[PDB]
């Protein structure tokens, strides 16, 4: 196995043992001003997702050519316009004559805590090449050009996930699923096993509100220190990523008999082509047991009509997946850093959830 493009990139070699910490290459004092050359008849673009026509072009490309997942426009705005987003980081390739969008990659900024270091980075998602254009080395140009546009802004490290093995994962996660609506998945013995309570068990559970932004921010910031790869969110970012939006993101806080918010659970919405799936986001416990929190999360997903509840095995999730009758799925989710060498880690030390 030899990686034509990735072996030229500042990332560790597959199977080299890493005992050191830091950048493979130094920050750059001068960066290429010019966009990388594309084949004749194609052009670069910085998509402005605030224009609804542009947003709908992105939406069309992703549903027809991405990983079937049904990313909504509202969902894309949540994922791709967090604080600090830039339109040039919504990097597209268009046919010159028709302006047809045929390629995409995106970067959003994040402060990333990796072992004893915190570095300003970008997260990379939604790399997509039109089906009629696959296997033509278009992906390496998108990666190089988004790298160039990120460098112009003074950032030299990135974090991302992918289902394929590349040099070199800092960690590997397995996807697990919990059947909420067994009928759509498909006998009476099976439907009975997965019956969940109609109402949650934990006292003081309620939707997150505007007033909970500070305490949710504080609870998440102190919970994440026990992991080795985590985001460091401002209060503005906590608002964007957790404030509830129908069919996008759900957050429930635990407010106790004294009125203290001590726990919260969160999951985002991604339907499949329909099949409505919930994805475990961040779940923070300081007084409610984690097994009760997640049990209530399953109940809340069923009440809201989700057919399936998905969770990775990262953070502390192994302590409850089997007990709540999750089933392991096929494939793996790999975590990668770009231009950062460090020792790899077990799933349970990863504290970063990327959609």
Ligand X SMILES: C#CCCC1(CCCCCCCCC(=O)SCCNC(=O)CCNC(=O)[C@@H](O)C(C)(C)COP(=O)(O)OP(=O)(O)OC[C@H]2O[C@@H](n3cnc4c(N)ncnc43)[C@H](O)[C@@H]2OP(=O)(O)O)N=N1
C-beta separation of 136 from 105 below 8 A: no
Residue 126, annotated ligand binder? yes
Is residue 312 within 8 Å of residue 280, measured between CB atoms? Answer: yes
Q: How far is the CB of 7 from ligand X (least distance, A)?
A: 7
Query: Which of ligand X, Mg ion, none interacts with 220 (beta carbon under 5 to 8 A by kind)?
Result: none
* Residue 194 phi, psi dihedral angles, 5° rounding: -90, 15
Least Å from the CB of residue 93 to Mg ion: 10
Contact at 8 Å (CB) between 328 and 322? no
Is 5 annotated as belonging to a binding site? Answer: yes
Residue among 109, 99, 105 nearest 54 (CA): 99
CB of 35 to ligand X, least distance (A): 14
> What is the helix (H) or strand (E) element at residue 131, kind and residue range?
none
3-state secondary structure 98-126: CCCEEEEEEEEEEEEEECCEEEEEEEEEE
125 binds, among Mg ion, ligand X, none (CB under 5 to 8 A by kind): ligand X
Binding partner selected for residue 66 from ligand X, Mg ion, none, CB under the kind-specific 5 to 8 Å limit: ligand X
Closest listed residue to residue 228, CA positions, set 115, 325, 71, 333: 115
Q: Is 138 marked within a binding site? A: yes
Only one of the segments 34-42, 77-85, 126-134, 347-355 lies at the binding site for Mg ion (rule: CB under 5 A); that segment is 126-134
User: Using CB under 6 A as the criterion, what x/- string covers residues 87-126 for binding ligand X?
Assistant: -----------------------------------x-xxx
Binding-site residues from annotation for tetradecanoyl-CoA: 4-6, 126-129, 135, 137-139
Binding region for ligand X (CB under 6 A):
3-6, 65-67, 122, 124-129, 134-140, 143, 146-147, 150, 155-158, 160, 162, 164, 166, 338
């Amino acid at each position: 196995r030899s990686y034509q493009f990735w072996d030229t990139q500042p990332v560790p070699k597959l199977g080299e043992v890493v005992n050191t910490h830091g950048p493979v290459e130094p920050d750059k004092d001068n960066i290429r001003q010019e966009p990388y050359t594309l084949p004749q008849g194609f052009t670069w673009d910085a998509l402005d997702l605030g224009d609804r026509g542009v947003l709908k072009e992105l939406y069309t490309l992703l549903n027809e050519n991405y990983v079937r997942f049904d990313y909504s426009p509202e969902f894309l705005l949540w994922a791709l316009r967090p604080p600090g987003w830039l339109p040039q980081w919504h990097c597209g390739v268009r046919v010159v004559s028709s302006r047809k969008l045929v390629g995409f990659i995106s970067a959003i900024p994040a402060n990333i805590h990796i072992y004893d270091t915190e570095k300003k980075m970008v997260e990379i998602n939604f790399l997509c090449v039109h089906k009629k254009l696959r296997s033509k080395r278009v992906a390496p140009v998108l990666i190089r050009e988004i790298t160039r546009r990120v460098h112009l802004e003074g950032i030299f490290q990135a974090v991302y996930t992918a289902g394929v093995v590349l040099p070199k994962p800092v960690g590997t996660c397995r996807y697990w699923h919990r059947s909420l609506n067994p009928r759509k998945l498909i006998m009476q013995r099976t439907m009975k096993l997965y019956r969940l309570p109609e109402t949650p068990k934990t006292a003081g559970l309620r939707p997150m509100e505007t007033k909970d932004i500070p305490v949710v921010h504080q609870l998440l910031t102190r919970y994440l220190k026990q992991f080795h790869l985590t985001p460091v969110m401002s209060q503005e970012e906590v608002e964007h990523w957790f404030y509830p939006q129908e069919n996008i993101i759900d957050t429930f806080v635990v407010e106790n008999a004294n009125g203290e918010v001590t726990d919260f659970l969160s999951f985002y919405t991604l339907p499949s082509t329909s099949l409505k799936a919930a994805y475990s986001f961040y779940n923070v416990h300081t007084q409610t047991p984690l097994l009760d929190l997640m049990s209530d999360a399953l109940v809340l997903a069923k009440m809201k009509g989700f057919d399936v509840f998905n969770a990775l095995d990262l953070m502390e999730n192994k302590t409850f997946l089997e007990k709540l009758k999750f089933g392991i799925g096929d494939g793996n989710l790999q975590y990668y850093l770009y231009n950062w060498k460090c020792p790899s880690m077990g799933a349970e030390k990863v504290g970063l959830v990327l959609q």
